[PDB]
Amino acid sequence: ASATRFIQWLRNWASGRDLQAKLQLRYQEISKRTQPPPKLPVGPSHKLSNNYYCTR
Amino acid sequence: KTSFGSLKDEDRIFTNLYGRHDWRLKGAQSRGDWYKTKEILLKGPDWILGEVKTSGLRGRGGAGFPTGLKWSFMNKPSDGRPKYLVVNADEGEPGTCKDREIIRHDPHKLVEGCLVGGRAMGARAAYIYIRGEFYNEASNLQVAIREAYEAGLIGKNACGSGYDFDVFVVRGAGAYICGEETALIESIEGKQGKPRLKPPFPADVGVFGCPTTVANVETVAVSPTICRRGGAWFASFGRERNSGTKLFNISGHVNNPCTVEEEMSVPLKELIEKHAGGVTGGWDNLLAVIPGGSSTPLIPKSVCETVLMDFDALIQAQTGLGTAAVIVMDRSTDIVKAIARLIEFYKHESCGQCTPCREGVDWMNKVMARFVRGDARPAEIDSLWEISKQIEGHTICALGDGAAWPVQGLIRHFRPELEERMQQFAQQH
Numbered sequence A: 001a002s003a004t005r006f007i008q009w010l011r012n013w014a015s016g017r018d019l020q021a022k023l024q025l026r027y028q029e030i031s032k033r034t035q036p037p038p039k040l041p042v043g044p045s046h047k048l049s050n051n052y053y054c055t056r
Numbered sequence B: 001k002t003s004f005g006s007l008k009d010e011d012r013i014f015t016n017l018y019g020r021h022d023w024r025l026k027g028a029q030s031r032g033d034w035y036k037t038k039e040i041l042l043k044g045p046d047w048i049l050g051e052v053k054t055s056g057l058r059g060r061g062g063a064g065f066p067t068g069l070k071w072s073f074m075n076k077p078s079d080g081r082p083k084y085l086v087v088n089a090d091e092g093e094p095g096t097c098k099d100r101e102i103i104r105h106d107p108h109k110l111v112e113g114c115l116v117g118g119r120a121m122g123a124r125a126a127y128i129y130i131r132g133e134f135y136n137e138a139s140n141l142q143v144a145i146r147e148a149y150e151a152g153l154i155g156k157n158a159c160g161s162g163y164d165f166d167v168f169v170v171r172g173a174g175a176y177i178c179g180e181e182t183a184l185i186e187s188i189e190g191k192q193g194k195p196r197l198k199p200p201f202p203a204d205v206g207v208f209g210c211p212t213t214v215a216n217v218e219t220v221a222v223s224p225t226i227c228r229r230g231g232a233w234f235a236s237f238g239r240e241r242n243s244g245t246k247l248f249n250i251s252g253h254v255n256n257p258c259t260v261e262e263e264m265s266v267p268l269k270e271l272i273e274k275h276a277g278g279v280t281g282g283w284d285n286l287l288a289v290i291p292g293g294s295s296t297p298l299i300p301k302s303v304c305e306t307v308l309m310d311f312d313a314l315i316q317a318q319t320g321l322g323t324a325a326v327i328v329m330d331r332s333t334d335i336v337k338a339i340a341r342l343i344e345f346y347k348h349e350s351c352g353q354c355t356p357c358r359e360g361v362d363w364m365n366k367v368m369a370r371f372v373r374g375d376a377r378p379a380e381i382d383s384l385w386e387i388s389k390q391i392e393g394h395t396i397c398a399l400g401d402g403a404a405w406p407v408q409g410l411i412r413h414f415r416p417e418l419e420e421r422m423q424q425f426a427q428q429h
């Protein structure tokens, strides 16, 4: 992401592609390495009634 | 007939219900007890069992089994063991207190019933099990028994009939469960009051491991009258298969809570208004009734308007006649708290023997306690319904059934009250 304009033009032309739009090096687009805590859902068998194991 | 009630006093069996006449032997004889008892004993068990069958008498201890057929289990040839009649005077069902009145005011009906009933069963003696709190009542019964011995009415050559019969009184020590027929037998034997599995049935292996019949105090005390006046006379009161007269207790929110004798199949409304003076605050102030003691499901006012007081009428209302103890709750009652307190009672009376009631009833109690405060979620209501169904029909004795039924009645007819209470707790938190 820090290539000079001349170098960006040179490598785009040599490859025949616009490489700057799809850089193979990652910067700030990736997700934060600290995330808010999850709250995961429970499955269909998490019920207090009409849930006898012999039916499932 | 199609209408019942308005029992005439000449048709009332327990003519000394209120203890306004001498309860001792002289008063009892003047009222018709002990009359022609020798002739009855000389007619033989088959004739005695025949009258009881024709009478349509059903067990007055709460389960309502046909008495004539039950007593006939004992009419078999002797195998060498003694045979016994155990009279269940445990009287422990909350709301119930009719057997207390017979024991202290008409004790000679019970003693004569023990002799007549014991003769039909071929028994040698009667053990009357009386709850230990009924100390004065047990003392009266004991004085009456002594009078009966001194007059030759019981004992060797009873009434001159040539039949030997003894009447023992043995007191309990504080346990509702000891009213259960096989727990009562276990208690007489000196053990903890834990019920037996069946089979064997008591008629084969009972008290001391002998042929035994357990009969309720009211059931036994009416047998001499049925024999004197005829099973046809008894069968002429009440609906078919619901024969006879019945002692009722009306307690709770009525003007004049009382014990009375009335015809079987009397309307519940008629019974409350004629004898108990009506519902506190009027009939429209009624919320629910528990018709047959704490073990029977409650019914709401809409059902009480027309329900008849007998076994089959109350089964169709999704409850039972039980002991015929009527606890009335008016509209000021916390119906959830009222039922919760009954579940607490069952938690304290469980003998603890078998898993579903030892664990389940205490579990139901904790859930009901939170339902009273509303500290629950509506999904727990169906959870509580399923829990009560895992106890009912899975336990050794009917106490587990008797705990599940009150809960099912509350959920059946008062779910919106339960849910509204949970909704209120949700806001205030």
Ligand SMILES: Cc1cc2nc3c(=O)[nH]c(=O)nc-3n(C[C@H](O)[C@H](O)[C@H](O)COP(=O)(O)O)c2cc1C
Pocket (backbone or CB within 6 Å): B058, B059, B060, B061, B062, B063, B064, B065, B088, B089, B090, B091, B092, B093, B176, B177, B178, B179, B180, B181, B182, B214, B215, B216, B217, B219, B220, B397, B398, B399, B402
């Ligand atoms: C927990 C429990 C308590 C009972 N208490 C009594 C009681 O106090 N008096 C009674 O007659 N029957 C009581 N019973 C019913 C007896 O087990 C039995 O059905 C009755 O004594 C039979 O006599 P009966 O046919 O004349 O009614 C109780 C049953 C249970 C399960």
Ligand code: SF4
Pocket (backbone or CB within 6 Å): B177, B194, B195, B349, B350, B351, B352, B353, B354, B355, B357, B358, B395, B396, B397, B398, B399, B400, B401
């Ligand atoms: S149901 Fe309850 S009272 Fe009856 S035997 Fe089981 S634990 Fe004891």
